[PDB]
Design a protein around this ligand. Structure first.
Ligand code: SF4
Ligand code: ZN
Ligand code: ZN
Ligand code: ZN
Lengths: 131, 752, 42, 103, 96
């Protein structure tokens, strides 16, 4: 539910203390109380049923956008744009090559968003950030 | 008659001429010989339109340049009235010259007003009419039916018949009003809209509204076809700034954002299905965007973009798509995260007044969306919708709203302001947030018009003060002057009513609208005026909610029951069709002598364009000064911009706008100097605003009438209506109020 | 009804009634005893 | 009560029906109200009066009513001078004495 | 033309016709609605620019609403008196 935390099962109505805490590894509607419950002792697996991804308490954050897919796309764009930051001044005014660079960075962002080529793109971005 | 001004022969279609008309032709001819912009205010009632048309047609024919005439009016009804006057003028010119010269005159309006298609005729929205006509006339339907004759898609036969005949053979030479053009195109089974839209380059004069010159969503196609040295006439241009602001404004609601999310999801499903079926129809578009071709190159001339260009074409970027939105899925994700950012900005508990630059910086730092990809949002969305070949477009209208918002707030940063109000209306229990992107500078929309055309004739019957508009709109006037009519007898008797019968001061402030004393005074005044007015009455209110409250409590207190004994009561409904039925009912009841009263908003639909001549006027009962809602954020932002950029005081601007709305309400009662009618103004605050009236109304307003109560106003109205019910002396008006040809010759010889 | 607001939940109950609540003179016109009528109101 | 110009004109039409063709058919209306209520359309009655060669002269009391002006203009062959409005006592007497002359 | 309020009792026999009276009001708009001349075509004035998307008019330029945003019914009496005026005028348009 967009209003209710499935892990602790508490409504917004009679308990307005819950918060929209999400995890970049796996985006789950989990309140701050459940986060301070489970992951304060240590890293654990995702309390959502059907998911078992490891996750950390300090990596938790609140979701800015209502849509989960848009939020993860923006987070992936943040994780790419920090190292992928060539500008038109980096290209010495070459507009066509800058547009090709924009196409390439949007394509690798899309690939990381859908996970179709996650291994090769991840290796490429590691090799790019090592410079 | 036929007469000469300098070396220009003028064929006036009347045997008699008003002196103010001749001075009007003299001033326009001086302006056109000099070649500058001008603001000319004839009094209403005199034949402003016939004078403009007569002199401009004479100038176009006799002078060899044959400069095109762009008669920009404010409403479609006034366009039709100008077309009727032009038809009468050309009939007179054909009669006098003995032949019909090579001449083309057409009126331009939307598809809804010019759709003879029996299927798409009963649609109540112009947008669905446009989308259905585009669906039947994009050429995609034509080529689909050509390749597949058994395809279920159909074509509009009115559009298809235009392919048989040439552009110059669409209509016979002459002037076609909307009724005559509709009748002719119904007889010949042709589309009048596409006939008008293709003959713009061929018309000697084309008459359209201000939206077809100021709003770039539709003026982009029109302004290319018109000549760049044409004579431009702005008729009734006293509210041209409202059209300029409305051209570059947009309001976004949370329902619009929800429909935008739904449309983005539908677009993602459609692009996924097309990619599953055929990726070539996307690959060719992608490589064309790589080459740098824009929407105008990709789209053919006979089709139109799905999202109209919401900004000035001079402000559009010429370089190619940046590439962040070049791929279809990349642009879909870009649009989706932009809509989600707008939803995030929508959720707030107070009002934010932020510049476009601050909004763009916040959007960039929170979403990594830059300004340059946003500047291509409308063009890219239109190209994507074209290449997707979607049959239905109802789910992508909110996408049009989002693209319009994105292009508007990316291209424009100066003179604009974004207002996010947590409460759209304060009366609602649940909050309904709204995002308003308003245009603070009215000169932005009209700036390319003055650049393109050297000579622009700004004209309204009730434009005052004249110097306010060159400060408001950045243009220079070679000459500006306001005429006062010369009358044998005082044809109109204005008065300012500052108090009721019991000397209780009367006002129409929105906070005191529930006062029983003021409402009782207004009701007694209206009852007495309905008792003493012969033919009809028109009543103007500052706002529609003020009308709703005061009429509801009038019917509660039984005032309207007394009104029903004399005149039929008709109220301007928010529905335009019911308002038109009420207006024609009012005209019918004034014609047969039943007597009727019309309650209208002083800033509403009836106040613009609709005239009340002779029997349809006879009294303009103005309930209060039509001030705007002062604490609305858009108005306050515009007032601050006017104060900071043009040193115009906020109270001065509010008084000017309210007084010009009042003046255009008063100007509708007169047509011809034989016409008469009183102008009563029921507020205590008109009394200081006598100088802010137009010059001719100020001349008609005596100093003793500035602080009347109800009773002596009624007595003066009775004496006035008894006075000019008498037949006027022809010797008293033979050469002082109206001129014959000999009087015009005598005045011409006396001037030199 | 006054501690639900202390916890954030809106009460539908107003606070109860426990917290904070609130001659014949002589006659001279003896010839019309009963003809005149009493008027304690206008 | 509330006057009815259409009922008065219809009854005048009925009364002037047996009038011979040599005798001129005229209707003098001393109309005082500014609004009138008609059971049906009054323009049909105006057209019927024009077709029957009936000339209507209306002496108004308060102001210039548009339907009376139109009726006087149509019934007097485009003449707008048959709608007379008084000014005072003497003007009323002059207007009454103006109607004894044959049109 | 009075504003109807739910606190009034009405009459239970007569009030059964209220829905059918609204049906008659809907039917009255059928033969009253007809195309008008372009001189007074106020419907086409707002349809002259069909793609205009300017600032939404405020609550002063709009009919009144309740606390819930629903219509308060004061426009209903305006439509009723306009319908009454139209009915009086169209009653003259007959063979009489
Ligand atoms: S082509 Fe003309 S008649 Fe046919 S649908 Fe379009 S606007 Fe209507
Ligand atoms: Zn929880
Ligand atoms: Zn998980
Ligand atoms: Zn106590």
């Amino acid at each position: 539910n967009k209003d209710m935390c499935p892990i602790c099962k508490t409504d917004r109505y009679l308990s307005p203390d819950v918060k929209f805490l999400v995890n970049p590894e796996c985006y789950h509607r989990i309140c701050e109380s459940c986060v301070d419950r489970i992951f304060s002792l240590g890293p654990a697996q995702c309390p959502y049923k059907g998911c078992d991804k490891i996750l950390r308490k300090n990596k938790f954050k609140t979701q800015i956008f209502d849509d989960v897919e848009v939020e993860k796309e923006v987070d992936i764009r943040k994780r790419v744009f920090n190292v992928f930051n060539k500008t038109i001044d980096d290209f010495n005014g070459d507009l066509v090559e800058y547009n090709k660079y924009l196409e390439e960075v949007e394509d690798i962002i899309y690939k990381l968003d859908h996970g179709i080529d996650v291994a090769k793109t991840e290796e490429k971005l590691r090799t790019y950030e090592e410079l | 008659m036929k007469f000469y001004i300098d070396d220009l022969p003028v064929l006036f279609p009347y045997p008699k001429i008003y002196p103010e008309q001749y001075n009007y032709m003299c001033d326009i001819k001086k302006t056109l010989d000099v070649g500058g912009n001008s603001i000319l205010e004839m009094p209403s009632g005199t034949g402003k339109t016939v004078s403009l048309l007569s002199l401009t047609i004479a100038y176009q024919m006799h002078y060899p340049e044959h400069r095109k005439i762009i008669y920009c009016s404010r409403t479609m009804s006034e366009i039709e009235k100008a077309l009727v006057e032009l038809e009468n003028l050309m009939d007179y010119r054909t009669k006098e010259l003995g032949y019909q010269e090579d001449f083309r005159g057409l009126g331009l309006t939307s598809r809804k007003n010019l759709c003879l298609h029996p299927e798409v005729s009963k649609e109540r929205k112009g947008t669905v009419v446009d989308e259905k006509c585009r669906r039947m006339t994009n050429g995609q339907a034509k080529r689909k039916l050509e390749e597949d004759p058994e395809a279920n898609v159909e074509l509009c036969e009115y559009h298809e018949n235009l392919y048989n005949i040439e552009v110059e053979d669409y209509l016979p030479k002459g002037v076609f009003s909307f009724e005559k053009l509709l009748k002719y195109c119904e007889e010949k089974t042709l589309c009048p809209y596409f006939i008008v839209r293709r003959m713009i380059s061929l018309c000697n004069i084309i008459i359209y509204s201000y939206h077809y010159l100021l709003d770039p969503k539709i003026a982009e196609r029109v302004s290319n076809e018109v000549s760049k040295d044409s004579i431009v006439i702005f008729d009734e241009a006293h509210n041209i700034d409202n059209v300029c602001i409305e051209s570059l404004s947009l309001d976004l609601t949370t329902d619009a954002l929800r429909r935008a999310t739904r449309g983005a999801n539908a677009l993602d499903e459609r692009i996924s299905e097309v990619r599953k079926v055929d990726s070539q129809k996307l690959q060719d578009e992608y490589e064309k965007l790589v080459q740098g071709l824009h929407s105008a190159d990709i789209l053919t001339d006979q089709e139109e973009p799905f999202v109209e260009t919401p900004v000035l074409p001079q402000d559009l970027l010429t370089e190619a798509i940046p590439g962040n939105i070049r791929r279809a899925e990349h642009f879909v994700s870009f649009l989706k995260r932009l809509i989600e950012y707008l939803k995030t900005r929508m959720k707030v508990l107070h009002v934010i007044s932020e510049t476009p630059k601050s909004f763009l910086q916040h959007l960039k730092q929170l979403t990594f969306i830059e300004r340059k990809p946003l500047r291509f949002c409308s063009e890219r969305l239109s190209l994507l919708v074209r290449t997707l070949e979607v049959t239905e477009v109802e789910d992508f209208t909110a996408l049009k709203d989002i693209a319009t918002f994105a292009t508007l707030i990316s291209t424009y940063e100066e003179g604009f302001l974004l207002i996010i109000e947590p409460y759209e209306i304060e009366n609602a229990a649940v909050p309904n947030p709204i995002m308003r992107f308003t245009c603070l500078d009215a000169s932005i929309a009209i700036k390319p018009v003055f650049e393109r055309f050297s000579s622009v004739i700004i004209t309204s019957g009730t434009i005052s003060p004249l110097d306010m508009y060159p400060r408001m709109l950045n243009f220079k006037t070679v000459l500006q002057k306001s005429y006062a009519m010369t009358l044998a007898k005082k044809s109109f008797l204005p008065m300012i009513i500052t108090k009721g019968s019991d000397q209780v001061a009367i006002s129409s402030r929105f906070e005191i609208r529930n006062d029983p004393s003021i409402v009782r005074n207004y009701g007694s005044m209206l009852v007495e005026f309905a008792k003493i007015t012969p033919d009809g009455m028109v009543v103007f209110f500052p706002s529609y909610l003020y009308m709703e409250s005061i009429v509801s409590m009038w019917q509660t207190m039984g005032i309207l029951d007394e009104v029903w004994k004399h005149k039929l009561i008709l109220v301007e409904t928010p529905d335009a069709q019911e308002t038109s039925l009420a207006l024609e009912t009012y005209r019918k009841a004034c014609s047969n002598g039943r007597g009727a009263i019309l309650l209208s908003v002083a800033r509403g639909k009836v106040s613009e364009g609709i005239d009340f001549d002779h029997q349809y006027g006879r009294t303009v009962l103005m309930i209060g000064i039509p001030f705007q809602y002062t604490e609305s954020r858009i108005l306050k932002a515009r007032l601050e911009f006017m104060r900071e950029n043009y040193r115009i005081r906020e109270n001065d601007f509010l008084s000017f706008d309210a007084m010009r709305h009042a003046a255009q309400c008063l100007g509708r009662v007169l047509r011809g100097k034989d016409d008469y009618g009183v102008m009563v103004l029921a507020d205590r605050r008109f009394s200081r605003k006598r100088s802010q009236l137009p010059k001719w109304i100020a001349q008609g307003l005596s100093d003793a009438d500035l602080n009347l109560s109800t009773d002596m106003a009624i007595s003066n109205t009775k004496q006035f209506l008894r006075t000019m019910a008498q037949p006027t002396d022809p010797k008293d008006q033979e050469g002082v109020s109206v001129w014959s040809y000999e009087d015009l010759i005598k005045h011409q010889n006396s001037r030199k | 009804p006054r501690k639900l607001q202390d916890l954030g939940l809106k009460p539908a109950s107003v606070d109860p009634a426990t917290i904070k609540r609130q001659r014949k003179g002589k006659i001279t016109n003896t010839h019309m005893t009963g003809i005149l009528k009493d008027y304690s109101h206008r | 009560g509330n006057p009815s110009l259409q009922n008065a004109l219809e009854m005048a039409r009925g009364l002037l029906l047996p009038v011979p063709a040599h005798c001129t058919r005229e209707v003098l209306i001393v109309f005082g109200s500014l609004s009138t209520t008609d059971p049906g359309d009054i323009h049909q009655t105006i057209d019927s009066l024009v077709s029957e060669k009936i000339r209507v002269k209306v002496l108004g009391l308060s102001a210039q009513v548009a339907i009376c002006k139109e009726l006087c203009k149509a019934t007097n062959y485009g003449d707008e001078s048959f709608y007379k409005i008084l000014l005072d006592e003497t003007h009323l007497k002059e207007l009454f004495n103006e109607a004894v002359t044959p049109l | 033309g009075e504003k109807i309020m739910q606190n009034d009792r009405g009459d239970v026999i007569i009030d059964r016709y209220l829905t059918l009276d609204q049906e008659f009001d809907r039917k009255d708009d059928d033969m009253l609605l007809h195309p008008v001349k372009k001189i007074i075509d106020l419907d086409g004035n707002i349809q002259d620019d069909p793609v205009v998307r300017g600032n939404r008019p405020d609550f002063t330029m709009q009919p009144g609403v309740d606390i819930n945003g629903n219509s308060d019914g004061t426009v209903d009496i305006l439509k009723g008196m306009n319908r009454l005026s139209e009915k009086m005028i169209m009653a003259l348009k007959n063979e009489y």
